[PDB]
Amino acid sequence: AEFLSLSKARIEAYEKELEKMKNIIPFDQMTIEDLNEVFPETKLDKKKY
Amino acid sequence: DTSTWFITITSMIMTLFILFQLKISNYSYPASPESIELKTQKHSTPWEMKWTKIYL
Amino acid sequence: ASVVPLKDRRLLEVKLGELPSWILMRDFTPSGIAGAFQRGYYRYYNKYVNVKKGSVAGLSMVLAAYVVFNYCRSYKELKHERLRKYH
Amino acid sequence: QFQFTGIKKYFNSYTLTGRMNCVLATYGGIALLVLYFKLRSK
């Protein structure tokens, strides 16, 4: 029952992730930082191409 | 014309390369957007592997 | 006087080219989607009609301002005028 | 002042070789000398 114990919170955290994923897309012309959660940014000299 | 004496413009050119490194530094690359979709796929697949190991 | 000249360009940008996005400006962004290019249009005759998404009247006013601003410095040198007027 | 920390990570990267305007300053400052000298001898 450890799968029924541990992955139950992993189900609801994935279920809550589907709630915030609806929030981010918003308007077409929405934001330059709210779109900076899914698509990534990094430190200096990461993107080679 | 053949102008002279040069104490002018060249000190007013390097102030300009504080401007152009300010504007062009805030640009966006289309390619970086295709990279963030890759790491989201492998993370939940390993999380499902963490759930498969939670089964096995 | 710095907040005076800075509020000149931010008025001559967001009206006649091109009023950007970043919500808190989202409906302000579509305010440029209709554009004030219909307001900017009537000066030439009609002909620069292509201003819809490559906006001529947004840009061609600054470059028309930078010409007549540089006509003033050249005026002292190329005098040429008689004791009369031209044709 | 914020025309610095936007590009301050860039500066000490490449100004180690890029900020050698002293050779431009020496080739400029010597170029000052011959033109004041020719107008001195007219």
Curated annotation (Swiss-Prot), chain B:
Membrane-topology annotation of the record: Single-pass membrane protein
GO CC list: mitochondrial membrane; proton-transporting ATP synthase complex
Compartments where located: Mitochondrion membrane
Organism per entry: Sus scrofa
Protein name in the entry: ATP synthase F(0) complex subunit 8
Function per UniProt: Subunit 8, of the mitochondrial membrane ATP synthase complex (F(1)F(0) ATP synthase or Complex V) that produces ATP from ADP in the presence of a proton gradient across the membrane which is generated by electron transport complexes of the respiratory chain. ATP synthase complex consist of a soluble F(1) head domain - the catalytic core - and a membrane F(1) domain - the membrane proton channel. These two domains are linked by a central stalk rotating inside the F(1) region and a stationary peripheral stalk.
Chief localization: mitochondrion
Top-level lineage group: Eukaryota
Positions carrying N6-succinyllysine: K50
GO terms for MF: proton transmembrane transporter activity
Curated annotation (Swiss-Prot), chain C:
One Gene Ontology cellular component annotation held by this UniProt entry: proton-transporting ATP synthase complex
Residues with Phosphoserine modification: S2
Residue numbers of N6-acetyllysine PTMs: K15
BP-aspect Gene Ontology terms: ATP biosynthetic process; proton transmembrane transport
Keywords, alphabetical: Acetylation, ATP synthesis, CF(0), Hydrogen ion transport, Ion transport, Membrane, Mitochondrion, Mitochondrion inner membrane, Phosphoprotein, Transmembrane, Transmembrane helix, Transport
Main location: mitochondrion
Modified residues annotated as N-acetylalanine in this record: A1
Membrane topology listed for this record: Single-pass membrane protein
Transmembrane regions listed in the UniProt entry: 61-78
Taxonomic superkingdom: Eukaryota
Protein's cellular compartments: Mitochondrion; Mitochondrion inner membrane
InterPro entries noted in UniProt: F1F0-ATPsyn_F_prd (IPR019344)
Family label: Belongs to the ATPase F chain family.
Annotated PANTHER family: ATP SYNTHASE F CHAIN, MITOCHONDRIAL-RELATED, ATP SYNTHASE SUBUNIT F, MITOCHONDRIAL
UniProt function note: Subunit f, of the mitochondrial membrane ATP synthase complex (F(1)F(0) ATP synthase or Complex V) that produces ATP from ADP in the presence of a proton gradient across the membrane which is generated by electron transport complexes of the respiratory chain. ATP synthase complex consist of a soluble F(1) head domain - the catalytic core - and a membrane F(1) domain - the membrane proton channel. These two domains are linked by a central stalk rotating inside the F(1) region and a stationary peripheral stalk.
Subunit structure: Component of the ATP synthase complex composed at least of ATP5F1A/subunit alpha, ATP5F1B/subunit beta, ATP5MC1/subunit c (homooctomer), MT-ATP6/subunit a, MT-ATP8/subunit 8, ATP5ME/subunit e, ATP5MF/subunit f, ATP5MG/subunit g, ATP5MK/subunit k, ATP5MJ/subunit j, ATP5F1C/subunit gamma, ATP5F1D/subunit delta, ATP5F1E/subunit epsilon, ATP5PF/subunit F6, ATP5PB/subunit b, ATP5PD/subunit d, ATP5PO/subunit OSCP.
UniProt-recorded name of the protein: ATP synthase F(0) complex subunit f, mitochondrial
Species per Swiss-Prot/TrEMBL record: Sus scrofa
Lineage: Eukaryota, Metazoa, Chordata, Craniata, Vertebrata
Gene name tied to this protein: ATP5MF
